[PDB]
């Protein structure tokens, strides 16, 4: 709920302003930011066949997408990030995943832990 409400609002705005793409470089900062966030989230919803994700990993990925830790990244890279990051959080952050899965919600401690994980990974990401 927490992550998908924001994602749905942002994708609705992106769908509103999507017709202005291919000209968006000549429009105001608000339209360009809507377009950018929308392209990032659209690249975030792609998925490979026969590989369903757990709900907590989906929550982590959508958290990275909607909180703004992908705006500086290039679109063609988003998928790669979403893959690498995932592997990362599956190996060295199983405790936060277990917490999110057992509590069903992102607590404030869990929110801070997610924020730290994603900002440090993005700082060390290629």
């Amino acid at each position: 709920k927490q992550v998908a409400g924001t994602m749905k609002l942002e994708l609705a705005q992106y769908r509103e302003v999507a017709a202005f793409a291919q000209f968006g470089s000549d429009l105001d900062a608000a339209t360009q930011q809507l377009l950018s966030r929308g392209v990032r989230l659209t690249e975030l919803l792609k998925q490979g066949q026969y590989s369903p994700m757990a709900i907590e990993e989906q929550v982590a990925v959508i958290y990275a997408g909607v909180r703004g830790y992908l705006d500086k990244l290039e679109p063609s890279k988003i998928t790669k990030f979403e893959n690498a990051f995932l592997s990362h959080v599956v190996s060295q952050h199983q405790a936060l995943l277990g917490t999110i899965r057992a509590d069903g919600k992102i607590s404030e401690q869990s929110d801070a832990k997610l924020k730290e994980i994603v900002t440090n990974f993005l700082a060390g990401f290629e």
């Binding site: 017709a19 202005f20 000209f23 000549d26 429009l27 105001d28």
Partner: protein
């Protein structure tokens, strides 16, 4: 046919979307053009204050004339390039009917493309890539060099541009361009001290560059306004056609369903 109507619906819907986006883009560019038109207008109108205070009147009997027309490389504006071309053709006619040897200059590819089929003997140089990026003083400087480094010693000139009045209104204006011999031989210039032919030459060159810059900065704003209104009208007409074709499509799909039902019913009734 239902498929023809669906094809046409999809086509006109795409056209309506594209024209709406183009109207928004033209609005964004017109905002910047009208912002930059204020200091450019102060500059370009202070460049002409001398000839209005000294009341230079140009020659009535001189022979050679240089006619500049300011437009762009982009269409979808309306009557911008057509207004410039009409004024240029009218002036060429009225000058050649007085024996004056006229040479044309077209800033922007549209004016040259319009005039090159009928007025091509009377042509000196043309300029390209006007309209994509906003005009700069470097553009006016380059145009002024290639008008000076051309060997066509003109006696008088005019420049025909689209003076910007409002978002809806622009007017095709014409400004005069004087030679060294016109401002040197004027009796009203006897009050300007420390003047010789060299300073007047430098001053006339710089003022050529200035009037070209001012014309470009007026024409860009006029053209962006015209393109915004034109794309607005295109979107309006596309929406009208979309509504009429949606009515026709619903009519045709109802007719197709009824016809298929009637075929099935008549096939079943014959058993």
């Amino acid at each position: 046919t239902l498929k023809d109507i669906t094809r046409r619906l999809k086509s006109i819907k795409n056209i309506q979307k594209i024209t709406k986006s183009m109207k928004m883009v033209a609005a964004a560019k017109y905002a910047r053009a009208e912002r930059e038109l204020k200091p450019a207008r102060i500059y370009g109108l202070g460049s002409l204050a001398l000839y209005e205070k000294a009341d230079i009147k140009g020659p009535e009997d001189k022979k050679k004339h240089l006619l500049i027309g300011v437009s762009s490389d982009r269409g979808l504006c309306g009557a911008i390039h057509s207004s410039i071309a009409k004024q240029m053709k009218s002036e060429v006619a009225t000058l050649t009917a007085a024996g004056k040897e006229v040479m044309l200059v077209g800033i922007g590819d549209k004016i040259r493309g319009i005039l090159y089929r009928t007025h091509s003997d009377q042509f000196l140089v043309a300029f390209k890539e006007v309209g994509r990026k906003p005009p700069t003083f470097g553009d006016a400087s380059v145009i002024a060099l290639e008008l000076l480094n051309s060997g066509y010693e003109f006696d008088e000139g005019s420049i025909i541009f689209n003076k910007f009045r409002s978002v809806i209104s622009y007017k095709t204006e014409e400004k005069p361009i004087f030679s060294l011999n016109t401002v040197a031989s004027a009796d009203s210039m006897s009050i300007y001290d420390d003047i010789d032919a060299d300073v007047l030459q430098n001053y006339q060159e710089y003022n050529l560059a200035n009037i070209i810059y001012y014309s470009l900065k007026e024409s860009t704003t006029s053209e962006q306004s015209a393109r915004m209104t034109a794309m607005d009208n295109a979107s309006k007409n596309a929406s009208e056609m979309i509504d009429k074709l949606t009515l026709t499509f619903n009519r045709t799909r109802q007719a197709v369903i009824t016809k298929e039902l009637i075929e099935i019913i008549s096939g079943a009734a014959a058993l």
